[PDB]
Design a protein around this ligand. Structure first.
Ligand SMILES: CC(C)NCc1ccc(N(C)C)cc1
Length: 460
């Protein structure tokens, strides 16, 4: 039985509005309704992994697991295995996988983050799951961010608290937050960003939705605009939205948007919005293709409609050679030429690099770089030809070209990371000097850049 080099992943997000679901929710898992939908000819083909995020979920874990498993069995005739389930308050994540994957999945982590302080601590935050699928790390975050059209900044703050404090993936990657720990990271949920138009325009907005004319609405979607201004979700992707706003509906129909201010809304308007979203971030030059992104039309117990997204995701096998794991392969090396970090920091300390990768026996610390002043005020940290030669565990190019090097630039004075990034070893050539580049972030904000050249030697 050959190991896969691709899997398909289903991501679902549904704010259930504290109501039990209807008896049939199969349309969600089939990616049927509005938007980019799945072909009917695929209906019996199971995805490899289903990741279900709920918000305002009134069910016990047992209740929801029984509905999910029975739903997938009806669709596919496959009895899925439970990989992980984690609930914070009414925010839940479930990971289900095909039984054949049971012994491909390992290192299962779960965590949660509670957002806000005092007043604003008590129902919003995130849950997450991570695991290894053979040689590939996968992370999944389901967040319920702060509500309300005038709280986009709070949402952005919630995002930064979640990516700082959610503890998933390999703890040895200590300088790296979840935005660097995974081959593929999927972040979804009731992100609660709104279409930011005047209240008086409510009926105009509804008209536009009935005409399936989303362009003038998406140009005011706070998540798109905040992302464009680099305020949130830097270096994530989202598929084009081609489905109607998923909030706020009258229950038991989808024919009416309930937008008017009510005591029950704290006297806030809920103009039709794309609250419910799926985004991802994959390491450079790894295969990831969104094959569906849409909302169901026939599940109406909540004031939100479920959202689905599906992906093709490249995966690698758990490689064993005669040498590594358990030693180096002398036929492999990674060299760096003419490298320098450009940092936004106003500080003057010395910096060194750390190289982390599962292709190394352990992380590698460089010597300190040489600080110079950039022509436009910047700190430039020059490594020149001084960076160490990295010794991979396996030299076979079928392994090494699929690997990635995480880089942290750290202060000598404090050992704190000022910036993190990632370099793919999927090069155009081996034994050849080639440009490399990564942006550097810290707490998911841009802090600088790392650039230079790489020279990769494999056993071919
Ligand atoms: C250079 C390339 C990777 N940038 C892709 C890219 C990423 C995000 C956005 N927006 C508008 C949020 C636009 C483009």
């Amino acid at each position: 039985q050959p190991e896969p080099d691709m899997i398909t992943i289903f991501i679902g997000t549904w704010n259930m509005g504290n109501a039990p679901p209807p008896k049939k929710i199969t349309s969600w898992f089939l990616s049927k309704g509005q938007g980019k939908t799945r072909d009917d000819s695929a209906d019996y083909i199971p995805h490899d992994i289903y990741v279900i995020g709920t918000q305002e979920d009134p069910l016990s874990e047992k209740e929801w697991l029984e509905i999910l498993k029975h739903s997938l069995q009806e669709i596919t005739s496959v009895t899925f295995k439970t990989v992980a389930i984690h609930t914070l308050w009414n925010i839940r994540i479930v990971v289900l996988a095909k039984p054949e994957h049971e012994n491909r999945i390992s290192h299962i982590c779960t965590d949660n983050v509670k957002t806000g302080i005092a007043n604003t601590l008590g129902n919003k935050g995130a849950v997450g799951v991570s695991f290894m699928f053979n040689g590939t790390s996968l992370g999944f975050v389901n967040s319920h961010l702060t509500s309300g059209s005038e709280k986009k900044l709070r949402r952005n703050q919630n995002y930064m608290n979640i990516l700082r404090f959610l503890a998933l993936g390999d703890k040895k990657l200590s300088p790296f937050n979840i935005t660097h720990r995974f081959t593929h990271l999927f972040w979804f949920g009731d992100l609660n960003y709104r279409v930011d138009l005047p209240t008086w325009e409510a009926e105009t907005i509804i008209q536009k939705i009935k005409q399936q004319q989303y362009a003038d609405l998406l140009s005011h979607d706070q998540l798109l605009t905040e992302r464009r201004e680099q305020k949130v979700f830097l270096h994530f992707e989202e598929e084009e939205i081609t489905f109607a706003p998923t909030y706020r509906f009258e229950r038991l129909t989808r024919d009416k948007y309930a937008y008017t201010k009510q005591k029950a809304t704290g006297m806030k308007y809920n103009l039709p919005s794309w609250c419910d979203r799926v985004l991802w971030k994959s390491y450079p030059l790894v295969h990831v293709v969104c094959q569906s992104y849409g909302s169901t039309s026939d599940i109406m117990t909540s004031d939100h409609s479920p959202v689905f997204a599906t992906f093709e995701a490249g995966v690698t096998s758990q490689f064993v050679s005669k040498n590594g794991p358990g030693t180096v392969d002398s036929q492999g090396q990674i060299e760096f030429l003419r490298c320098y970090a450009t940092l936004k920091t106003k500080s003057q300390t010395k910096f060194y690099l750390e190289f982390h990768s599962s292709c190394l026996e352990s992380f590698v610390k460089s010597q300190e770089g040489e600080n110079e002043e950039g022509s436009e005020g910047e700190l430039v940290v020059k490594f020149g030809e001084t960076l160490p030669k990295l010794k991979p565990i396996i030299s076979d190019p079928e392994y090494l070209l699929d690997q990635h090097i995480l880089i942290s630039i750290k202060s000598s004075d404090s050992d704190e990371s000022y910036g993190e990034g990632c370099i793919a070893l999927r090069l155009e050539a081996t034994e050849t000097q080639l440009p490399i580049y990564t942006p550097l972030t810290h707490h998911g904000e841009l802090t600088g850049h790392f650039q230079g050249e790489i020279k990769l030697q494999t056993s071919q």
